[PDB]
Design an enzyme around this catalytic site. Structure first.
Site, PDB file in Angstrom:
ATOM      1  N   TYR A 120       0.835  -1.230   0.000  1.00 37.37           N
ATOM      2  CA  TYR A 120       0.000   0.000   0.000  1.00 37.37           C
ATOM      3  C   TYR A 120       0.864   1.272   0.000  1.00 37.37           C
ATOM      4  CZ  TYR A 120      -4.305  -2.645  -0.194  1.00 37.37           C
ATOM      5  OH  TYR A 120      -5.335  -3.419  -0.641  1.00 37.37           O
ATOM      6  N   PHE A 396     -10.773  -3.138  10.341  1.00 32.41           N
ATOM      7  CA  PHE A 396     -11.842  -3.098   9.314  1.00 32.41           C
ATOM      8  C   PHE A 396     -11.218  -3.476   7.977  1.00 32.41           C
ATOM      9  CE2 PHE A 396     -10.171   1.227   9.490  1.00 32.41           C
ATOM     10  CZ  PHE A 396      -9.917   1.481   8.163  1.00 32.41           C
TER      11      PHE A 396
HETATM   12  C1  LIG Z   1     -20.539  -6.034   1.492  1.00 30.82           C
HETATM   13  C2  LIG Z   1     -19.810  -4.907   2.196  1.00 30.82           C
HETATM   14  C3  LIG Z   1     -18.514  -5.383   2.851  1.00 30.82           C
HETATM   15  C4  LIG Z   1     -17.917  -4.252   3.672  1.00 30.82           C
HETATM   16  C5  LIG Z   1     -16.605  -4.706   4.339  1.00 30.82           C
HETATM   17  C6  LIG Z   1     -16.887  -5.949   5.199  1.00 30.82           C
HETATM   18  C7  LIG Z   1     -17.941  -6.868   4.886  1.00 30.82           C
HETATM   19  S1  LIG Z   1     -17.992  -8.122   6.054  1.00 30.82           S
HETATM   20  C8  LIG Z   1     -16.721  -7.578   7.017  1.00 30.82           C
HETATM   21  N1  LIG Z   1     -16.194  -8.079   8.139  1.00 30.82           N
HETATM   22  C9  LIG Z   1     -15.158  -7.450   8.719  1.00 30.82           C
HETATM   23  S2  LIG Z   1     -14.492  -8.169  10.249  1.00 30.82           S
HETATM   24  C10 LIG Z   1     -13.320  -6.991  11.041  1.00 30.82           C
HETATM   25  C11 LIG Z   1     -11.933  -7.325  10.504  1.00 30.82           C
HETATM   26  O1  LIG Z   1     -11.140  -7.836  11.207  1.00 30.82           O
HETATM   27  N2  LIG Z   1     -11.611  -7.030   9.112  1.00 30.82           N
HETATM   28  C12 LIG Z   1     -10.293  -7.348   8.524  1.00 30.82           C
HETATM   29  C13 LIG Z   1     -10.397  -8.485   7.448  1.00 30.82           C
HETATM   30  N3  LIG Z   1     -11.445  -8.413   6.777  1.00 30.82           N
HETATM   31  C14 LIG Z   1     -11.142  -8.226   5.379  1.00 30.82           C
HETATM   32  C15 LIG Z   1     -12.395  -8.227   4.475  1.00 30.82           C
HETATM   33  C16 LIG Z   1     -13.611  -8.618   5.153  1.00 30.82           C
HETATM   34  C17 LIG Z   1     -13.447  -9.747   6.035  1.00 30.82           C
HETATM   35  C18 LIG Z   1     -12.328  -9.519   7.071  1.00 30.82           C
HETATM   36  N4  LIG Z   1     -14.620  -6.337   8.235  1.00 30.82           N
HETATM   37  C19 LIG Z   1     -15.086  -5.764   7.124  1.00 30.82           C
HETATM   38  N5  LIG Z   1     -14.489  -4.565   6.624  1.00 30.82           N
HETATM   39  C20 LIG Z   1     -16.182  -6.401   6.474  1.00 30.82           C
HETATM   40  C21 LIG Z   1     -18.814  -6.647   3.663  1.00 30.82           C
END
Ligand SMILES: CC[C@H]1CCc2c(sc3nc(SCC(=O)NCCN4CCCCC4)nc(N)c23)C1
Ligand SMILES: CC[C@H]1CCc2c(sc3nc(SCC(=O)NCCN4CCCCC4)nc(N)c23)C1
Ligand SMILES: CC[C@H]1CCc2c(sc3nc(SCC(=O)NCCN4CCCCC4)nc(N)c23)C1
Ligand SMILES: CC[C@H]1CCc2c(sc3nc(SCC(=O)NCCN4CCCCC4)nc(N)c23)C1
Ligand code: NA
Ligand code: NA
Ligand code: NA
Ligand code: NA
Lengths: 396, 396, 396, 396
Positions: A120, A396
């Site tokens: 990045y 996130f």
């Molecule tokens: C359909 C919209 C998207 C928005 C981002 C998003 C989701 S699930 C979700 N859960 C999460 S869990 C919190 C976390 O530790 N995220 C880091 C790794 N991350 C990478 C991509 C998603 C899965 C895990 N985070 C999101 N941004 C999101 C759906």
């Protein structure tokens, strides 16, 4: 291959790419919660000819920066290229389009958590917070005579079930995130998700418990496989008294050998103990990454150290403009100029300086920041330093 | 049990206690070299009735502190109590007598390396430097476009045998130790010892090699058992160019998977790479510990940050005096007073602040440092901060 | 103890013995699917007096042998003796009865996968295929300039959900199994079972994904515990272009450190890379075992190498007959004779030679194959060699 | 930087670069022994301006190829570039000059052992032998009824001290190396070195023992740290009887759990046991690499399989010439032509085919070998195959 905002038809293909790209992926139900934070034109997809072979989006966030200033922040996330379509310039194309939309929408900063450290930088993101894992061997841990909350009488801390005290966690977190650089607003949907992860899963994580103080809480659970390790997922303390009281309670988990937490480099925990060495650093990594989208807007928005006397310089950001920068009485004025540059750096370097996690002097020693004036370097170091240590809110 | 300066008859008993107390002990031959740094009345022994059951001594050192000021320093070492004579107050008695002799002899500071983190705080020693182990996976390491010494033409760095370039290492080290807080003078006897450890030992360490630049050197050897790990024992660089050139050469050790070094938290190495995450923190510990023997002499001797405006306060050290402290134009004046204390701390806390390795704000958050004035805390943080990052010279 | 074909009453006792004998046992639901491949008189049970203390059966299979010839094959499976009834001759009795039924039913060959390597030799089974695990460190993997499918433009490979492309996997597999010695027909019930195993299980395996090419597919999943390892359960490629394209896609799994596959010794993967050493052999074992039931029928059925000139010999199989063997123009004629034997071997040895996985010369060097003629040995080696390398289809 | 043959003054600098480049380096005393095999103009050095920053040499070897033909072979060795002088084209320059000298001197082939798998392909070296580590759990190992040397009466094998039977080892090795492709002549200086490594070293290897048969020997020692593992450094057997007798004796090391050996893929050991699975493949790697220096001289020198009928083709080696290749009655004729190529490959690929360790069909499947004729591919496979399996003699 074409690059477009996804239609509702595209999302099944996006969730397949997600499942195949992210191991820690919860299914489309958690996806629905997080999707509420994605604005109308916040997502791009690449289609082959046709299936989804690339995607990227940003969420609307609120990030606290030094001086307790809250900035609208584009949180980049859900970035994936199909393993079938590597080395095809899809990431560069998607990042160029999202940065266009983010800049045009009026965000002064973008932010992400990096899957790898080498990606990045070239798109102008600098690591801006530091994750610091401390592991305490609690069998040896004794509190220093100076440590608060040692006296006789009742405990200020309660062992509780997280789901039964949602209102109290929300209010404590809301106070914490407004006070601490790196703090993020946590919307209702993310509290829904956090408290759903608090329950045990069959062949999964163990039940989460909470330690609750009027001015802080800790969320912890016993490790899946190491039954003598308690992992603190989150400790938010608004006062020193709360921080110490919560650690007295955690060190009271007499069935554990070890307590671990992902914290920040300035966590005072080690200094609460008679043996500072018992709070061992077991892991260290970049946390939040920042891309400064609008240099003058970002530099004028944050507060600066009052201790450093008024000074003026000329800052050039590589392909990001040249500015007359005047810092005095804890405020910056940052205006266009064609005057000779006194300081030069790439955009990513400014992101690394911005929350005070990295010293200008350290970046200068690696030639990431260029000046001929060692006095100017000392003044930048002092001015960009954060009074309140920078912390990491939630991934996130 | 009696406490006395050892006679020449006592030293065999002291070397037996040493062999039984320190696993890393080289026999009496290395002991002879180091003993030249122990002054006439620098040693105490405890005899039972009669054998040696306790010992402690100090060596005459020269320690660099912020502002490139060199202080005479009593280096405590060779501290041991027989396993037969624990919990008998022998350590307290020996430390009380040596501190008496050190103070009376006119040393403003004492210093040690701690075998354990929980011992020396109660005798007024604070951890003053931080050891930071970086492990680089050199197979992935690529230098940033900004990193110095990337251009075409010859290398400034030579692969050499340490013993054949003693004069050059001595001169580079001598420049380094005078410039860097934590720097120690390395006398001829310790160069004798270092270059003797450079050779391979049968069933022991492998041969040491050196990378030599006009303004820096690195001493390294392949690990005993992990044949894909090179351990840098020592890297002294007087310029950023030297530091980068030496790391380009170390990353050129193509038969290694990993390069490790015990360095300081502000080592610019990670920022020299396209992926900052490749320089992983694998270990973190207290390095040098300081006991401030004479509060006013120590506080007046070091330089302070020029950026912070003149300010006056009243500092009380617990059983160490109360002083009117005025800091301006990078200098302190520290005079006796009975005026109300604005800042209170134990002696050990002042040791931790003294080389700039720990922030007053961090110690305040653990209640190791007490004030009611948050402005005064910001001013102390800024003033005690070191322009040149504090490093660790050599263990003793 | 009596030996009989099981009645429907016997199957609960058989499923209990199965659960207690096989750790990898799925319950009676998968058992129902596989049971459709067991012919009417394909099973034997031993009853004590009364409970099930022994069982064995065979399934009706179709096995591809050199020359693209498909043989009816008795697949021995579900073989168990109760831990209460060891060393009682139950395995010998059950194998004798099943071999009687298999021979009388007109199967030219029987086959199994061995739980241990030391059991089945004495019943005339020889190891006939070799399982070869390759582990690729994909972080270093670069494709050779010669490797197919490197040019610009779109990818031929799609990332898909297995269940949504059943028809395409079936058709690709059906082409593969008819072309490759070791290939087995995969009936509809086994496609039902495979695609049911493709979904994630709570506290079990992670979700399976597929890479789909017109002429090949790969089924893979991230390992349960090692989240940086992708395990390819199955790669079926009908063309070299398909094989290379699928491996380009697998090496594109950028979140993985390692890709592992259980393949065959002649897998061209290592030769696709600039560093052949990156495709490391991490495991090697016997795959399919063969018992030649009818020596002349088996030897006349397969194709032989065209390169070797016509030759005649006399082969004796230990207690399996003596035959005049004439091999020319890629075909064998194998007729009864009392002429002096030129070649002698046990039945198991012929099974090991039959698909070309083991050289007659290698077996001769261990005295498992006896001749006085080194020319005859060279001719056998050449004739029994398989043009198309022998592979393993699926375990049963 | 200049490239020259070293003067006697250059060798101290070469031994320093050696010590710093090779961990397994014995000092200049073993260097003296091996140096006797380096011809007068066999070495090149690169000097900076001045110190040794690069070196490479070849030794005069005799390599056995299929048909028991012995070729003069340039054994490349002692190849090092200083870590200060990477990415400067020093390896390319040194390899170009040595290949010039090797070709002009009249060597038909060059050979090396590769420190890494990704280096030598681009200089025309192909991996030509395969190292196969077998680990036997000797506690379970039972010899097959067919295995030779099972009968009553005395043993043919003696447990001896290596140094006391030098003459016998020399004579057995000399018979082995002339019979086996991959065999190398072992001169007196290398027997001196081998028998010096046979003795125990303080904090080093344990004492070596020998098992001696009239037609074979095994050299073994107990592992340094794993006291239940015997490592066979070398087993040379001229007869099947010798090979079996030596393995009966090794399996008789009743104080060991495991016997390991680095052998070849066709080692008959597994087939000597009732459980073939007990001889587990624990490691697999490229052994000897070959660069064909003179294509026609190399192809005409080796013997070919008699089983394949006479055939003619046109072989193009990428920048190595185009040749009319006629193979019949186990001999090749290889003459210049401008006729259309029927087969194309890089020089490295021919090296990989040359000792029969790799099939033309396997290399064709990776597109390293290009033809449109599948019949021609079958004929090449058969013709280049080695009757006697290729083995690895000794590392250099
Ligand atoms: C359909 C919209 C998207 C928005 C981002 C998003 C989701 S699930 C979700 N859960 C999460 S869990 C919190 C976390 O530790 N995220 C880091 C790794 N991350 C990478 C991509 C998603 C899965 C895990 N985070 C999101 N941004 C999101 C759906
Ligand atoms: C007889 C006078 C004393 C002076 C201290 C002293 C020696 S040997 C020696 N060697 C060393 S080796 C450098 C080192 O890493 N020291 C830490 C551990 N240390 C504790 C006590 C000594 C052994 C190792 N250091 C000494 N201070 C000394 C003899
Ligand atoms: C009632 C008829 C029998 C037929 C064999 C059979 C089943 S379930 C089943 N599942 C499988 S799973 C594929 C596999 O990797 N098999 C090897 C180990 N195997 C041993 C015995 C069965 C369990 C696992 N295989 C069967 N033959 C069978 C029921
Ligand atoms: C001065 C002439 C050279 C000739 C090659 C040579 C020596 S020592 C020696 N010892 C050996 S030990 C046998 C062995 O496993 N060699 C592989 C690794 N090898 C790389 C370079 C040398 C050290 C180990 N081999 C040499 N070629 C040599 C000196
Ligand atoms: Na605040
Ligand atoms: Na300085
Ligand atoms: Na075929
Ligand atoms: Na031979």
């Amino acid at each position: 291959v074409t690059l477009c905002s996804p239609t509702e038809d595209d999302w099944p293909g996006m969730f397949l790419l997600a499942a195949a790209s992210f191991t820690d992926f919860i299914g489309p139900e958690s996806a629905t919660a997080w999707r509420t934070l994605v604005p109308t034109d916040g997502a791009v997809v690449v289609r082959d000819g046709s299936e989804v072979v690339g995607m990227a989006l940003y969420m609307d966030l609120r990030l606290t920066v030094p001086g307790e200033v809250v900035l609208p922040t584009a949180g980049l996330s859900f970035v994936a290229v199909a393993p079938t379509h590597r080395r095809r310039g899809l990431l560069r194309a998607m990042c160029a389009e999202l940065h266009r939309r983010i800049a045009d929408s009026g965000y002064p900063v973008a932010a992400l958590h990096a899957s790898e450290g080498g990606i990045y930088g070239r798109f102008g993101y600098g690591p801006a917070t530091t994750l610091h894992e401390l592991t305490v061997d609690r069998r040896f841990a004794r509190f220093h005579a100076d440590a608060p909350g040692g006296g006789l009488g009742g405990s200020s801390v309660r062992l509780v079930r997280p789901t039964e005290h949602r209102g109290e966690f929300e209010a404590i977190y809301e106070r914490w995130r407004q006070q601490v650089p790196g703090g993020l607003l946590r919307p209702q949907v993310l509290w829904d998700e956090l408290l759903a992860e608090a329950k045990a899963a069959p062949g999964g994580d163990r039940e989460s418990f909470a330690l609750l103080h009027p001015d802080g809480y800790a969320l912890y659970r016993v490790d899946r496989t190491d039954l003598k390790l308690a992992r603190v997922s989150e400790l938010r303390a608004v006062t020193a008294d709360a921080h110490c009281a919560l650690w007295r309670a955690l060190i009271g988990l007499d069935s554990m050998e070890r307590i671990s937490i992902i914290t920040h480099p300035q966590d005072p925990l080690p200094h609460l103990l008679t043996d500072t060495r018992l709070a061992r650093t077991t892991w260290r990594q970049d946390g939040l990454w920042l891309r400064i989208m609008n240099v003058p807007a970002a530099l004028e928005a944050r507060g600066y150290a009052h201790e450093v006397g008024e000074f003026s310089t000329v800052l050039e950001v590589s392909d990001g403009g040249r500015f007359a920068l005047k810092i005095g009485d804890g405020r910056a004025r940052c205006t266009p100029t064609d005057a000779a540059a006194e300081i030069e750096m790439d955009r990513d370097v400014l992101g690394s300086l911005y929350l005070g996690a990295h010293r200008a002097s350290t970046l200068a020693a690696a030639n990431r920041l260029r000046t001929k004036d060692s006095q100017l370097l000392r003044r930048l170091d002092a001015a960009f330093a954060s009074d309140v240590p920078v912390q990491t809110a939630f991934e996130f």
